[PDB]
Amino acid sequence: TIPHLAIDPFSLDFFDDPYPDQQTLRDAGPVVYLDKWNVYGVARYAEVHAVLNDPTTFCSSRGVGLSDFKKEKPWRPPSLILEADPPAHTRPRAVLSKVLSPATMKTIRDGFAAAADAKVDELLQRGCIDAIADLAEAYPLSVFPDAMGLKQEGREHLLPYAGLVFNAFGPPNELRQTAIERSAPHQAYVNEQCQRPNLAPGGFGACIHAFTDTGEITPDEAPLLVRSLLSAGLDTTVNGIGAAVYCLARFPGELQRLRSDPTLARNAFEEAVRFESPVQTFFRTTTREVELGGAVIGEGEKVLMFLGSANRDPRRWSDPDLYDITRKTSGHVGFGSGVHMCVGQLVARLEGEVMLSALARKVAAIDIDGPVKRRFNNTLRGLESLPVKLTPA
């Protein structure tokens, strides 16, 4: 039998303090039912991990938002990659995997690192900064659109476009309906930038389009794949980096360990992703009767996965509520898991690593001094403002 809960995981109150409610989602049972949205959810590591890794039973092509694409109209033309199942998922996934490969990362690494080092130097001259606007936002804006091959004009649409995209996975609450209603200028900007002539040579965009020349993808598929990176590639990392800086500020001891060993940079970042989980929730839809958490769920049912909760499940993590930069982070579901596991994870880890490496080397202390402000999103967790004083090494 399946416990009914009145928790609204897409409400402002939940966003503002999700942890007691997430403990309840986990502790009530391995499978729950949410009265407010009439859907099943699993919040424990074991179930979330199991669902991610059985795409046959828990498919994505019926949407990874609440909306069931088999019965409803998608808010936009579906992603070729995020919202598709094997075998169809395979080819577009292969393309983005090549474009965002370890080898590609070697070619851009030095530029990313110098940008990060320069960015921290610049902030140190001011002292009083906003770790969101001046760092978590500024840094990825300075490297990712260039690495994409994007024109300078119209970049201000990138953040709110991703905000839109992630709200749209949500239920039809105010956050979602207001996003979609204000969407047209963002979409129109994005659609211009997805076209072959507008993407600089040597960038992610052009590289994607090159796959049309070999017959690997069509001229129609090409722009939709660029759309994927512009949908998913920025706001996530912004929140990842913001999360890392927030953790180092709240856990001063962990910052000092990072200064003592800056090679901990990449793992400090991974641990921030586990701890805050910029992407909080995704859905799947059952393709058959299936037993999950000891309950039988019927075919065609949406299932809500609490990734951020799974990453804090005491059944899997010791002292889950502590930021520990030497934790074995392997296994966390912040980037998902299985066939859909984040295809841009190397890009994100590169941005986060080089940026925490710069902080590790150049900063002695990070102190919160001012009102902290949260940004609300149906899917993304992160801060709108984080005033900090940086003290130079």
Where on the chain is the footprint of ligand 8ZX (CB under 6 A)? 73-79, 81-82, 159-160, 162-163, 165, 224, 227-228, 231-232, 235, 375, 377, 380
Provide, rounded to whole angstroms, the least separation between the CB of residue 3 and ligand HEM.
25
User: Considering the rule CB under 6 A, would residue 334 count as an interface residue with ligand HEM?
Assistant: yes
Q: Which amino acid is at 245?
A: V
Residue 187's binding partner out of Cl ion, ligand 8ZX, ligand HEM, none, with CB under 5 to 8 Å set by partner kind: Cl ion
User: Considering the rule CB under 5 A, would residue 155 count as an interface residue with Cl ion?
Assistant: no
> Does residue 162 contact residue 235 with C-beta atoms inside 8 Å?
yes
Q: Name which of 275 and 282 has its Cβ closer to ligand HEM.
A: 282
Separation of alpha carbons 293 and 180, rounded Å: 35
Q: Name which of 29 and 242 has its Cβ closer to ligand HEM.
A: 242
Rounded to 5°, the CA angle 67-70-72 comes to 50
Q: Which of 33, 54, 68, 76 binds Cl ion (CB under 5 A)?
A: 76
> Does residue 325 contact residue 264 with C-beta atoms inside 8 Å?
yes
Provide, rounded to whole angstroms, the least separation between the CB of residue 393 and ligand HEM.
26
Q: Which amino acid is at 45?
A: Y
Separation of alpha carbons 235 and 258, rounded Å: 25
CA distances 248 to 266, 325, 373, Å, are 14, 10, 17
Separation of alpha carbons 268 and 329, rounded Å: 9
Residue 64's binding partner out of ligand 8ZX, ligand HEM, Cl ion, none, with CB under 5 to 8 Å set by partner kind: ligand HEM
Q: Which of 23, 24, 104, 187 binds Cl ion (CB under 5 A)?
A: 187
Provide, rounded to whole angstroms, the least separation between the CB of residue 235 and ligand 8ZX.
5
Q: Name which of 95 and 162 has its Cβ closer to ligand 8ZX.
A: 162
Give me the 344-383 binding string for ligand HEM, x by CB under 6 A, dash otherwise: x--xx-----------------------------------
Separation of alpha carbons 58 and 64, rounded Å: 10
What order do you get walking across the sheet with 32-34 strand by strand?
Answer: 4-5, 32-34, 39-42, 302-306, 281-286, 58-59
Q: Does 89 appear as a known binding residue?
A: yes
Separation of alpha carbons 377 and 164, rounded Å: 9
Q: Name which of 81 and 123 has its Cβ closer to ligand 8ZX.
A: 81
Annotate 48-85 with b (16+ C-beta within 10 A) or e (fewer): bbbbbebbebbbbbbbbbbbebeeeeebeebbbbbbbb
Task: Using alpha carbons, select from 310, 307, 309, 313 the residue that is nearest to residue 282.
Answer: 307
Q: Name which of 229 and 255 has its Cβ closer to ligand HEM.
A: 229
Q: Does 93 appear as a known binding residue?
A: yes
Q: Which amino acid is at 171?
A: P
Give me the 263-282 binding string for ligand HEM, x by CB under 6 A, dash otherwise: ----------x----xx--x
Provide, rounded to whole angstroms, the least separation between the CB of residue 120 and ligand HEM.
19
- What residue numbers does the annotated binding site for heme b cover? 89, 93, 284, 340, 342
Binding site for ligand HEM (CB under 6 A): 60, 64, 81-82, 93, 96, 100, 228-229, 232-233, 236-237, 240, 273, 278-279, 282, 334-336, 340, 342-344, 347-348
